[PDB]
Structure formats: structure tokens, C-alpha cells
Enzyme design. Structure first.
Site, mmCIF file in Angstrom:
data_model
loop_
_atom_site.group_PDB
_atom_site.id
_atom_site.type_symbol
_atom_site.label_atom_id
_atom_site.label_comp_id
_atom_site.label_asym_id
_atom_site.label_seq_id
_atom_site.Cartn_x
_atom_site.Cartn_y
_atom_site.Cartn_z
ATOM 1 N N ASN A 197 58.119 -45.795 0.201
ATOM 2 C CA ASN A 197 57.110 -46.795 0.581
ATOM 3 C C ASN A 197 56.968 -46.976 2.080
ATOM 4 O OD1 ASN A 197 58.518 -48.220 -2.170
ATOM 5 N ND2 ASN A 197 56.328 -47.756 -2.213
ATOM 6 N N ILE A 211 54.379 -49.505 6.269
ATOM 7 C CA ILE A 211 54.979 -50.028 5.026
ATOM 8 C C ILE A 211 53.903 -50.286 3.970
ATOM 9 C CG2 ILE A 211 56.384 -51.842 3.944
ATOM 10 C CD1 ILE A 211 57.255 -52.620 6.878
ATOM 11 N N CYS A 212 54.052 -49.610 2.834
ATOM 12 C CA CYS A 212 53.219 -49.820 1.666
ATOM 13 C C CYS A 212 53.744 -50.996 0.885
ATOM 14 C CB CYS A 212 53.248 -48.578 0.766
ATOM 15 S SG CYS A 212 51.977 -48.684 -0.528
ATOM 16 N N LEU A 213 53.148 -52.160 1.111
ATOM 17 C CA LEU A 213 53.574 -53.389 0.485
ATOM 18 C C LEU A 213 52.313 -54.209 0.239
ATOM 19 C CD1 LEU A 213 56.228 -54.979 -0.293
ATOM 20 C CD2 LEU A 213 56.032 -56.077 1.934
#
Length: 148
Positions: free
Chosen positions: A78, A85-87
Site C-alpha cells: 500500500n 500511501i494508498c489509504l
């Protein structure tokens, strides 16, 4: 302004009650630019690692999520090589009910439990699921190599 006042409030909050394994605050007099130190969660593949993150709040904060990126290179599905950041809560799921504490808690959580079904680095996601042993060997190696 709406923004500086919110940031100052969130700074008091996080200083009093920081998230576990995490600290964060302004780099200098400019309250919109913070830095954070996150320790690899104990018991995780990142344990012993010390990771640095840059945080930039908008003049339109809290209506736009903070921009948060890893400076420290990390092996994580992620989190990409540019520290993106993949959030969800940093993109389409942000709301002004959230705070920089909640963001940083969620990132800590992400190091503990990655989300391979919503990956930013698909190759690492695939490895986490098919060859966990090797994924974890590599995550540990990169922690020692880059975060120590």
C-alpha cells in the site's frame, strides 16, 4: 483561519495523546508542514524500523485531507517507491470529522495489517497472498536496510 486553528487544536491533541509508536508535529514556525516518526509495529515485519513521514496541510484544511508520504523506503503493498500511501481516508473517504491523529493511527494500523486487496504495488500484494514467507523476509530485509 479555519485551517490554522484546526491544526493548532490537532497539534495540542496529538501531543497530549499520541498514537502508539508514533509522534508528529510542525517542522518549524510554518504550522502547515509537519513531520512524523513512526516505529515499525512491535511484532510486525517492520519492527525495529524507524520511518519518517512528511505531512502537509492545505490552507483549506479540514476540507481537504493532509498530504502524507513516507520519506523512508518501505516494502509494503500500500506504499509505493515515491512514499505515496494508498489509504481510503487520505483520498475519497476523507472527512472534516477526521484528524491527523486518526490518519496516523490508520497508517500505523496499515503497517500492522496491509490491504493486499486494495494495493498500490500489486506485485507485493500478490506476494503477500501466495508466498507470505518470502514477502515477510523481504519486508524485514528492507526494514534493516533502509529504516535502521
Amino acid at each position: 483561519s479555519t485551517s490554522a486553528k484546526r491544526i493548532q487544536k490537532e497539534l495540542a491533541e496529538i501531543t497530549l495523546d499520541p498514537p502508539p509508536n508514533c509522534s508528529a508535529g510542525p517542522k518549524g514556525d510554518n504550522i502547515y508542514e509537519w513531520r512524523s516518526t513512526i516505529l515499525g509495529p512491535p511484532g510486525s515485519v517492520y519492527e525495529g524500523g524507524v520511518f519518517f513521514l512528511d505531512i502537509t496541510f492545505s490552507p483549506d484544511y479540514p476540507f481537504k485531507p493532509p498530504k502524507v508520504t513516507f520519506r523512508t523506503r518501505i516494502y509494503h503493498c500500500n506504499i509505493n517507491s515515491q512514499g505515496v500511501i494508498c489509504l481510503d481516508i487520505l483520498k475519497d473517504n476523507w472527512s472534516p470529522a477526521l484528524t491527523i491523529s486518526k490518519v496516523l493511527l490508520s497508517i500505523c494500523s496499515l503497517l500492522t495489517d496491509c490491504n493486499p486487496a486494495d494495493p498500490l504495488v500489486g506485485s507485493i500484494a500478490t506476494q503477500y497472498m501466495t508466498n507470505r514467507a518470502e514477502h515477510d523476509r523481504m519486508a524485514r530485509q528492507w526494514t534493516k536496510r533502509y529504516a535502521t
